[PDB]
Amino acid sequence: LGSNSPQEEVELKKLKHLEKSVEKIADQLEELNKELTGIQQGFLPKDLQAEALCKLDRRVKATIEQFMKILEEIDTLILPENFKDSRLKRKGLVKKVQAFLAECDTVEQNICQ
Amino acid sequence: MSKGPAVGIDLGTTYSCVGVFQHGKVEIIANDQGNRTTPSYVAFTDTERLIGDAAKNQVAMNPTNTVFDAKRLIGRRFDDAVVQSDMKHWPFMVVNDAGRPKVQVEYKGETKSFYPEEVSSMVLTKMKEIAEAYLGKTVTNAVVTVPAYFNDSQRQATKDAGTIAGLNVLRIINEPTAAAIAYGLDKKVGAERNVLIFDLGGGTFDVSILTIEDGIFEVKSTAGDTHLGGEDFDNRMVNHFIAEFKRKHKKDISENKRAVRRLRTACERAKRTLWSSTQASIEIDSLYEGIDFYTSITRARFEELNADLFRGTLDPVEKALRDAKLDKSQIHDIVLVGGSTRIPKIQKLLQDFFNGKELNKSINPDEAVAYGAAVQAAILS
């Protein structure tokens, strides 16, 4: 405890950059979620709602792929037991990405049906 | 832009490579993403056509409209046994057009079909653009390589791809010949030299025996396995890890495509680490059902998992020697080509077979063919 090393600062900076990359992808997901809600609860004729939902397909697949590439980059990190702050940050980031992926899967279940 | 030099291009089944001879040496050219090899991939989307890394990067999002392995189809008839066997494993459609194969895709909302030489011409166009971006000069002249076993139709279709791409194809030379040229094997003083080319890279395994006499190259024999490579070695590792996760947690991660992909990507990276290190570590948080997977693999374990595959690479070497009517003791030079030849066990098995003989391996194996083609291009310019 209280043995913080300069070396861990390098891993924490790598994780912060990954956190920023996740925030950018999460902003794309937020727009997709708002558009999906807008179609489901909006005033488009029931005959045109299928086409509007179907148009989100390319973007949701691109968002899923971006999150998968972040997971692959996080998976390159090797953190010793002593780097407790980095291990907590890594775990928190993976769970955040996995939660986002589950939201992407919900979008996929609601389009092109 | 002013006129540039002639280039050497290795048009591979999965990756392609371009080199240029200048300032007395070969420079292998990095693409726009900084990679010294470029995926031989072309993707068709709702709005554009993507080539190389950009096409490989979106394969998971658009599998049916992302073409690769065009080299397996070029110059072949639709009914060729190779075409029919290969078609079963591709996510894109292959159709028959009056006896000739065509790839069929959705492009900008319309159904389109392309001949294999058209697909290869798009890959060649990217390689030409890669050379121009680096040189800051226009590139028109090139030497393109082909496998030694390619027939007249396969050789002609490759030339056609070059012409379509707007390249002036100076010459078409065999891949094992290009590798021998890179090492200056034709330049060694004395009588005829027998050369064995061991090419394990890009999803194919090719063994070739060449005899060089007064600078003339003659192919004596060819042997190999059309579908063998790094993916097979990586797979053995994946099976090992899936079994380890079952033993440790009593959970099967095999049906979760994302968990298998995270594991496969980590295995590919660990395999590369094992080229120069004796152990590799893997840490994957929340791999499956929130379980963290922290493990490691030694180079010895990697070798054991792949023992039958590695040993099996010597059967083609024996078959090529038999077909060339030569004793192993009669082989003057051994050349390593392709990324999998970086595996120390493969090098050891081959050096032991040839009773301690040193291997020609100083040139990056992935680049050796482009290197030789770049030397040939400089000679013809």
Numbering used by the authors:
A (entry chain B): 148 to 260
B (entry chain A): 1 to 381
Provide passages from the article that reported this PDB entry.
To discriminate between fragments binding in the adenine sub-pocket, other sub-pockets in the ATP-binding site and/or potential secondary binding sites on the HSC70-NBD, we screened wild-type HSC70-NBD in parallel with two HSC70-NBD mutants (S275W and S275F), which block adenine binding to the HSC70 ATP-binding site. The relevance of these mutants was confirmed by their respective HSC70-NBD/BAG1 crystal structures, which showed that both mutations overlapped with the adenine ring of ATP in the ATP-bound HSC70-NBD/BAG1 complex. In addition, we confirmed by SPR that both mutants abolished binding of adenosine, ADP and 1.
The 70 kDa heat shock proteins (HSP70s) are an abundant family of ATP-dependent molecular chaperones, involved in many cellular processes including protein folding, prevention of protein aggregation, modulation of protein complexes, and protein transport between cellular compartments. HSP70s bind to extended hydrophobic sequences in newly synthesised and partially folded proteins, in a manner dependent on a cycle of ATP hydrolysis and ADP/ATP exchange. HSP70s consist of a conserved N-terminal nucleotide binding domain (NBD) with ATPase activity, a substrate binding domain (SBD), and a poorly conserved C-terminal domain which terminates with an EEVD tetratricopeptide repeat interaction motif123. The two main cytosolic HSP70s are the ubiquitously expressed HSC70 (HSPA8), and the stress-induced HSP72 (HSPA1A)3.
